[PDB]
Amino acid sequence: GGVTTFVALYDYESRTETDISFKKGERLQIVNNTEGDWWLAHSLTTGQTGYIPSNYVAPSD
């Protein structure tokens, strides 16, 4: 298996119908896979669920 939890490296403001906003430091779990530029994610911090830009996160605890 792959990375369990990712951390936001930057703030991100939602701009679509299917993405989510998140703040730097939020912990996010990827739902499908990490293929592509947009990952379906769930914020463990806020409970939000939606797509995030993959270059805004990195593996974390």
**59: Cβ contacts below 8 Å, ≥ 6 apart:** 3, 5, 6, 7
Place of tokens 């993959």: 54
Helix/strand/coil for 19: strand
CA–CA distance, 21 with 10 (Å, rounded to integer): 11
Extents of the domains making up the chain: 1-61
Instruction: Please tell me the distance from the alpha carbon of residue 39 to that of residue 2, in angstroms, as a whole number.
Output: 14
Give the method used: X-ray
